[PDB]
Ligand SMILES: N[C@@H](Cn1oc(=O)[nH]c1=O)C(=O)O
């Protein structure tokens with residue numbers, strides 16, 4: 001009767017509460033997706049347990065074994081019933097899982113340390129003093145691997161063979177590399193993550209230029225699940241009632257430090 | 259074998275070509291949705307005929323008869339197989355038709371004649387010298403009828419009982435009212451329409467403030483149609499290949515006059 005909700009530790013979507021080591025079960029976590037899961041379970045009327053994905057990945061298919069990892073893999077292999085997380089809606093994932101209509105709209109973006117002389121992806125692609133990368137194993141890395149746009153092909157050619165690796169294990173590792181690099185590392189990541197980090201101390205980073213593409217996050221269910229329909233309607237209801245706006249303001253802007 | 263694609267005359271989504279009276283069938287029309295229908299039919303491999311909806315409406319359900327009008331009605335009653343148009347994804351429509359993942363992201367917005375002293379919906383709601391309205395019978399009008407947010411409740415209370423009516427038959431009628439009103443009429447409409455009109459001569463209007471909500475347009479099919487799945491994948495492929503970006507630039511910005 002209790003459904004397993006897979007998700008990932010990614011601020012401010014899911015975070016440990018301050019005293020989480022004294023707490024158990026769902027009470028360990030807080031954040032936008034923890035709130036979204038509660039609101040959705042309320043409409044769909046289900047009990048659920050949040051489960052942080054073991055491998056800390058979003059979901060990609062290994063080109064050799066064809067095995068899905070990450071939250072996507074948890075759904076595909078029947079280990080979770082729903083993923084409530086900043087999981088980007090993408091073609092290759094829509095072939096194997098179902099997604100709700102998007103609960104947030106976003107785009108890939110550039111994060112720089114303040115004062116870095118970069119205003120656009122064209123600006124990063126034409127030089128080499130400033131290194132740049134993305135999260136390993138997610139949709140941003142696939143965006144660059146698959147692009148046929150000249151500027152993005154140029155960036156992919158640079159990242160794919162950069163040494164030491166510019167592909168990071170977590171977004172937090174990318175942000176910390178930006179922060180420690182004295183302006184010599186820029187990070188390509190989703191605009192929602194970029195906008196959150198910009199409002200957090202030490203307020204030393206900023207999003208530059210417009211977004212590179214336009215996409216969304218969706219709540220994901222196994223292909224054919226009976227949860228898919230009521231979840232989708234739940235998301236649309238929450239959107240129309242202004243709850244999603246309210247949550248984004250709560251988690252991004254109401255605490256802003258910058 | 260030829261599928262009926264319902265759509266609506268709305269610039270720059272679907273427009274008559276300059277010499278359309280000498281032309282027949284699909285060649286009569288041009289615009290973003292005409293291009294989108296061609297790209298989708300290419301992936302899904304179907305022949306199709308564009309059909310401008312008789313009543314020139316998007317789709318609403320009559321509260322008395324429960325009958326759907328507009329493009330939504332064409333789908334629900336089996337008179338078209340697909341709607342390719344700036345049809346907003348909404349809860350009440352998702353109960354009766356299917357939508358693709360969104361091909362465009364947008365929000366409700368305010369259109370003013372340049373120089374009008376309004377910078378926000380709060381600004382419109384607190385005065386009464388400047389009248390304001392929306393398209394009749396679409397999702398923007400429903401947004402205000404259904405809102406429980408104070409500022410929007412206040413605006414709905416004003417519009418619902420304004421005389422002469424502030425609800426317009428087409429977006430073009432709203433724009434022309436803005437233009438002719440000497441600053442005394444503002445129009446609430448979708449950001450994509452607002453951004454297009456701002457780049458068109460006589461360049462006397464502008465979008466003010468941020469958007470009131472965040473939603474999207476989707477390609478619509480009857481509930482349960484076998485087209486739904488291949489269309490959705492087609493849209494996602496076009497999104498990821500940068501075709502949707504390309505089309506938005508073609509139809510909004512590459513001709514811009516302002
Ligand atoms: N939401 C992304 C994960 N990821 O977060 C970023 O900022 N880039 C990136 O690839 C996914 O679902 O794969």
Ligand SMILES: N[C@@H](Cn1oc(=O)[nH]c1=O)C(=O)O
Nearest residue numbers: 316345346396397398447448
């Ligand atoms: N896309 C809207 C129609 N409409 O266009 C606007 O700008 N407002 C409005 O209601 C719909 O699908 O109902």
Ligand SMILES: [Zn+2]
Nearest residue numbers: 016018020021
């Ligand atoms: Zn800890």
Ligand SMILES: [Zn+2]
Nearest residue numbers: 274276278279
């Ligand atoms: Zn004519």
